[PDB]
Amino acid sequence: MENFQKVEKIGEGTYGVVYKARNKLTGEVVALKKIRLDTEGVPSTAIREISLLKELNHPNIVKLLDVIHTENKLYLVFEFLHQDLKKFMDASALTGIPLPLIKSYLFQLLQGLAFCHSHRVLHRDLKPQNLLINTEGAIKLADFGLARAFGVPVRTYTHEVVTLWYRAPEILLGCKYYSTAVDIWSLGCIFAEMVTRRALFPGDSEIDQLFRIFRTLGTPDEVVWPGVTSMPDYKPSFPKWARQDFSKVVPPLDEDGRSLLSQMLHYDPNKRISAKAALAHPFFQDVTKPVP
Amino acid sequence: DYHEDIHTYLREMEVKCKPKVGYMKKQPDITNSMRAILVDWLVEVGEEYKLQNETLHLAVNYIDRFLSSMSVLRGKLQLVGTAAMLLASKFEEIYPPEVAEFVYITDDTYTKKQVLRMEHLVLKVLTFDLAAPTVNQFLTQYFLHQQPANCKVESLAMFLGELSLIDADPYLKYLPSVIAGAAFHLALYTVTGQSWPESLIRKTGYTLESLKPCLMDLHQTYLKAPQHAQQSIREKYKNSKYHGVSLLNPPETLNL
Numbered sequence: 001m002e003n004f005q006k007v008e009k010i011g012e013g014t015y016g017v018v019y020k021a022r023n024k025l026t027g028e029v030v031a032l033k034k035i036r037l038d039t040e041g042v043p044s045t046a047i048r049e050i051s052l053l054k055e056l057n058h059p060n061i062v063k064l065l066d067v068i069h070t071e072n073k074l075y076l077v078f079e080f081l082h083q084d085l086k087k088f089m090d091a092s093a094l095t096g097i098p099l100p101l102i103k104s105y106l107f108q109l110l111q112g113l114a115f116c117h118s119h120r121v122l123h124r125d126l127k128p129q130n131l132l133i134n135t136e137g138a139i140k141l142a143d144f145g146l147a148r149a150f151g152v153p154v155r156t157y158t159h160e161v162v163t164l165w166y167r168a169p170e171i172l173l174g175c176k177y178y179s180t181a182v183d184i185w186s187l188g189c190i191f192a193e194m195v196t197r198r199a200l201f202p203g204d205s206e207i208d209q210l211f212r213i214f215r216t217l218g219t220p221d222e223v224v225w226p227g228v229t230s231m232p233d234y235k236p237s238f239p240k241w242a243r244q245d246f247s248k249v250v251p252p253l254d255e256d257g258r259s260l261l262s263q264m265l266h267y268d269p270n271k272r273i274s275a276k277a278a279l280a281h282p283f284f285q286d287v288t289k290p291v292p
Numbered sequence: 293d294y295h296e297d298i299h300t301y302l303r304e305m306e307v308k309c310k311p312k313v314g315y316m317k318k319q320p321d322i323t324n325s326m327r328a329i330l331v332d333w334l335v336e337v338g339e340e341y342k343l344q345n346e347t348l349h350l351a352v353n354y355i356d357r358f359l360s361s362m363s364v365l366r367g368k369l370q371l372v373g374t375a376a377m378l379l380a381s382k383f384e385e386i387y388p389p390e391v392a393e394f395v396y397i398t399d400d401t402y403t404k405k406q407v408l409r410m411e412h413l414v415l416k417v418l419t420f421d422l423a424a425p426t427v428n429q430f431l432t433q434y435f436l437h438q439q440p441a442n443c444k445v446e447s448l449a450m451f452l453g454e455l456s457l458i459d460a461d462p463y464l465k466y467l468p469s470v471i472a473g474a475a476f477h478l479a480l481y482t483v484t485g486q487s488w489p490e491s492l493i494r495k496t497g498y499t500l501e502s503l504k505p506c507l508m509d510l511h512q513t514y515l516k517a518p519q520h521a522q523q524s525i526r527e528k529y530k531n532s533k534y535h536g537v538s539l540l541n542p543p544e545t546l547n548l
């Protein structure tokens with residue numbers, strides 16, 4: 001680790017401390033992820049992040065550049081980006097994000113996510129704080145610490161994955177099985193959050209998060225989502241809200257953006273839109289790569 | 293359409309995550325027999341700790357790849373197997389067993405220090421490449437092509453799939469995708485008289501003909517299974533969970 005000069009502490013994400021650092025011989029600027037080891041060995045977060053990102057080389061997926069082990073330290077060396085999508089939306093809170101940049105950003109995310117899915121990887125924590133931007137108008141999936149390699153067909157994996165606000169309904173209802181739709185839900189949430197610069201479903205409990213979803217898309221029934229009413233954490237006591245009209249949910253949004261968001265927030269995970277299919281949606285006929 | 297994409301990626305990757313076929317001849321102090329004892333133990337270890345079958349298929353892939361590049365004396369072979377199984381559990385399990393339990397099941401043959409240090413060495417030697425295709429990852433996909441789904445066939449193909457793990461000769465010379473076809477067809481022919489379906493000849497590119505070499509080795513293994521020195525897989529596959537299909541009669545011939 002002698003070739004890197006610490007510049008500042010960037011922060012903490014899903015695990016470890018992240019530093020901005022300069023390579024003293026090449027001048028290259030990197031993000032270093034420090035992981036302390038004490039006393040179960042290398043965390044499963046690191047083992048999964050490293051192994052999966054080595055198989056996920058894509059321009060819309062952040063690059064793992066090296067892994068270093070020194071005494072009781074593990075450093076993952078990553079490409080650096082000066083900005084995350086969260087802080088960018090805070091700066092743009094009053095102004096707005098320009099629609100073509102909302103489109104470019106969503107396009108890129110679906111390209112990065114489609115690559116993950118076609119390489120049997122669930123991200124399972126897509127949210128503005130794990131999506132990084134640069135100056136050339138590029139956005140990238142980061143933090144695969146809570147990712148996982150999935151199978152065909154899926155087994156049961158970890159319950160209470162995904163940050164509450166971005167968590168799909170089939171998780172809150174405790175489906176035995178979840179797969180790639182979980183990741184599409186999150187980007188649904190993030191799409192609308194770019195449009196309105198407020199979080200779509202900002203719950204404080206699992207029940208409040210569900211009820212926010214139901215208030216907005218309607219309480220699902222055995223017609224909308226066959227199976228729902230006999231899912232583990234479904235209660236027949238739940239209020240029946242009718243479906244709010246989308247022109248109210250995302251006012252700024254054209255018929256094509258509304259069509260896509262609708263299909264990205266489909267209740268039934270089997271009918272919810274895939275990344276590949278989403279990329280082919282008319283909303284993306286006219287897409288460019290504008291600058292922030 | 294992300295399903296066909298995964299099958300393709302796994303077929304690319306199962307060629308790169310492949311161990312060297314005759315690596316055991318270059319191992320001065322260990323043999324196939326020692327290996328097959330360690331693998332059969334890791335089954336027993338899977339069962340006590342209720343680990344996924346995939347956890348075991350990955351641990352063996354890690355062991356074989358590690359022994360393809362590192363000389364290991366026999367007194368160290370259980371440590372490689374222990375470290376690989378801890379690595380595979382960390383990757384694939386919701387609740388990976390804690391290090392101090394992997395120590396307990398070695399009966400203090402090795403310290404925590406040694407298990408943790410072999411995990412670092414194993415990671416180093418596999419260059420953190422732990423997301424390897426397994427027989428079980430192809431099996432589970434093949435199972436979606438049943439006409440219709442048959443829980444005796446699934447458990448039998450899995451069972452057969454596990455039997456291949458034990459015997460480096462001649463299974464190490466077959467790709468996971470190919471073993472999993474042999475396993476599937478043999479389980480299907482055993483339980484229902486049906487054969488390798490058209491849907492999978494299209495998916496995989498594998499003719500029943502192309503599976504024949506592996507399917508004849510796997511037939512023998514199946515036949516000679518009750519007499520094999522390693523019996524932990526037949527014990528495990530009696531539980532009702534697996535529809536006690538290790539109690540079924542292998543066919544005498546395949547009409548090939």
Ligand SMILES: CC(C)c1[nH]nc2c(NCc3ccccc3-c3ccccc3)nc(SC3CCNCC3)nc12
Binds near residue numbers: 010031062079082143
């Ligand atoms: C590890 C790899 C994938 C990586 N590459 N670039 C990264 C980066 N740049 C962002 C930054 C740089 C320099 C000063 C400040 C910030 C910054 C800090 C907070 C919010 C917004 C911006 N940060 C992070 S850490 C994360 C903390 C939790 N969520 C958001 C960022 N990892 C980066």
